Design a protein around this ligand. Structure first.
Ligand SMILES: [Ca+2]
Ligand SMILES: [Ca+2]
Ligand code: NA
Ligand code: NA
Ligand SMILES: [Zn+2]
Ligand SMILES: [Zn+2]
Lengths: 296, 295
């Protein structure tokens, strides 16, 4: 039941909840994610970065997802290109069977951003594919400006938007007190009236961290978005919550553990079965937090 | 593309070389094996145990292989059920798209084995799929040649796994490795079909060295020496099952990266090195057995 990106997000937009966008790089990640979705009766946004695609091959990434779809034909799934860097990248994704693409030109000046986003929107929409873009850039305090988002959105005709409001990617998001400009968020939601996307939205739960640190990992100074901020973000109108770091930490936590507690262990399944479980649990909890659960 | 197990194996039988049959449990292993096949221009035998199929799902096991085949459409690949334990297990494999199946009933008595193996053979061959069976039990330090002749003749099986002193695991021999190549040649002679060596990992010194340098523990591990692997192929072994060497080579690199960088949690950083090490174990083995440049 692989479907357009904004079939899922239009629904999320009007009822006002969030849909986790979960990255994967292989079968283990993908399987855990679908099982979560199945267990929480939640829509799924599956996403792969350009790096992830390079690693597995686009034929395999789209191939694996379509096999998971047949297995759980009742879950609405969008397959989403995360941080597309160029038109040709978005275009390859579109030809391979992705149903959503993000074109990230938020490092460009407004006009170049708009110009490339609009080029992407047109071939995307022509093929039945939704598109994300970004305004402002991902560091905290830069921050998006509502009025140009209003304009940016109208001119490009883009399905969803990722306004920077103070998140950044990775395990170390805030050096100071968690700060996110919700007022900014609201103005943008208000002016644009489309699904909004929150990047760098991992939370870094205390159990996930503890699990990593117990296993020998090093996460000094790490700090994600608090569940509270994740919740408030959805009240603000965020409908897509990009989540990646949390999955990887939970996954590697168990790999590190198994490696530690048994030096004669080299059965791969022994390493990745607990890793899958831990990831799946991060995803199930996040689906409930954001309001995705039971939305099927 | 996917082809019948004994299309690959019959060629190996007459031209007198061994084809590695490599086990896989996920994408990383599958990819490594195919690149190795590509880089050495070798025909591929891909296998999945009942346990690996349950782990990934038989839909996904066949799925990724079909994707990997489109990727490398010039490489002959057989997809084989390893240690199928029941008629029902073999039959699901056949319906899912395998091109080969092993029905392992070697733990039964001759007549119970022949009876089940033939049952599998009949439905396999009816779906154009080839069949492997086993005779003797695997255990350090054995098949009976003249029943093998009857077994094969009665069953109409396409290849056979005669036991000659190999066993699964990183610990095949208490002391010095020993295998009965006389049995083998006699079996080959009496049967005149592709033969299969199970428990054939070599546990190369570099792979062991890598795993112990990463803090692994292979106390008392020994596998079949390259020399014996070679002799086996002279004897008439055409298919050499290889799993343990892969996992050790792969897991060593995982262990290393975990030890090397405690803040590292990018999966690809763990699995790219591990794929590379697996691929290299596969490429050397392909050369050793003589599958190399047979495409
Ligand atoms: Ca950006
Ligand atoms: Ca057996
Ligand atoms: Na995205
Ligand atoms: Na086998
Ligand atoms: Zn992002
Ligand atoms: Zn075996």
């Amino acid at each position: 039941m692989l479907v357009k990106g904004n079939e899922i997000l239009l629904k999320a937009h009007k009822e006002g909840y969030g849909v986790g966008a979960f990255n994967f790089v292989n079968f283990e990640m993908l399987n855990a994610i679908f099982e979560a979705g199945n267990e929480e009766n939640s829509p799924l946004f599956i996403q792969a970065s350009e790096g992830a695609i390079k690693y597995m091959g686009i034929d395999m990434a789209v191939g694996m997802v379509k096999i998971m779809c047949e297995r759980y034909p009742h879950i609405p799934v969008a397959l989403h290109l995360d941080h597309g860097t160029t038109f040709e990248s978005c275009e390859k994704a579109v030809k391979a069977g992705f149903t959503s693409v993000m074109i990230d030109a938020s490092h460009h000046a407004f006009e170049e951003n708009l110009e490339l986003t609009s080029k992407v929107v047109k071939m995307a929409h022509n093929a039945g594919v939704s598109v994300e873009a970004e305004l402002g850039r991902l560091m905290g305090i830069v921050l998006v400006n509502p009025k140009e988002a209003e304009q940016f959105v109208k001119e490009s005709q883009v399905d969803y938007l990722a306004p920077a409001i103070g998140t950044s990617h990775g395990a170390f998001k805030f050096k100071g007190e968690p700060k996110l400009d919700f007022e900014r968020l609201q103005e943008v939601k208000r002016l644009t009236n489309i699904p909004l996307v929150l990047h760098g939205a991992s939370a870094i739960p205390d159990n996930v961290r503890k699990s990593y640190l117990d296993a020998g990992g090093d996460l000094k100074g790490s700090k994600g978005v608090p569940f509270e901020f994740l919740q408030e973000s959805v009240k603000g109108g965020i409908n897509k919550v990009n989540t990646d770091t949390d999955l990887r930490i939970a996954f590697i936590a168990e790999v590190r553990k198994v490696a530690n507690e048994d030096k004669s262990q080299f059965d791969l399944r022994k390493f990745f079965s607990p890793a899958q479980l831990a990831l799946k649990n991060v995803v199930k909890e996040r689906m409930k937090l954001l309001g995705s659960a039971n939305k099927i």
